Amino acid sequence: NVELALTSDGRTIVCYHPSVDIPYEHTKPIPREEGPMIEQLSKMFFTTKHRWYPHGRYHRCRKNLNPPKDR
RNA sequence: GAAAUUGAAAUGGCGCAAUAGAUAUAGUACCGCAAGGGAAAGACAAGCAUAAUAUAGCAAGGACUA
Ligand SMILES: [Mg+2]
Ligand SMILES: [Mg+2]
């Protein structure tokens, strides 16, 4: 849904792209132990087990607790 | 590798500071049958602990919110 148009001199391309709204008809009304724990978490979040095991103090201390923040 | 020949006057350290300077705290201890050999030392390194560990690998780098 974009309108392309060179200008008369042909030196600049003009693109008209209005934002199209979602039609009302295209919408639905609003409705009104360590082992087993890690298996449950992996099933819940569609991950593997390895993510949920802890890490040693060395890794934990290596993690930066005051990371730079942008925007 | 010569000699002939020639004819110099007169308390200190750009030395060390205990692995250095004597081997030297001592020619002792100790070693050797013996001759001999011959030391060491006195005034937050490594290793650990606080705090073991998490898939993958020269152990880092690029990074990354992490
Ligand atoms: Mg000495
Ligand atoms: Mg140390």
SS3 A16: strand
Q: How far is CA A9 from the centre of its chain?
A: 42
Phi, psi (degrees; rounded to nearest 5) at A37: -65, -45
CB A37 within 8 A of CB A18: no
Joined together, the tokens standing for residue A38 give 């890690």
Residues 6 or more apart in contact with residue A37 via CB below 8 angstroms: A52
User: 3-state DSSP: chain A helix, strand, coil percent, rounded to 5?
Assistant: 35, 10, 55
Q: What's the alpha-carbon Rg for chain A, to the nearest Å?
A: 26
Joined together, the tokens standing for residue A6 give 């060179």
| Measured distance CA(A49)–CA(A37) in Å, rounded | 10
Rounded to whole angstroms, the distance from the CA of residue A40 to the C1' of nucleotide B14 is: 80
What technique was this entry resolved by?
cryo-EM
Please give the nucleotide, over all strands, whose C1' is closest to the CA of residue A68: B65
Please give the nucleotide, over all strands, whose C1' is closest to the CA of residue A51: B54
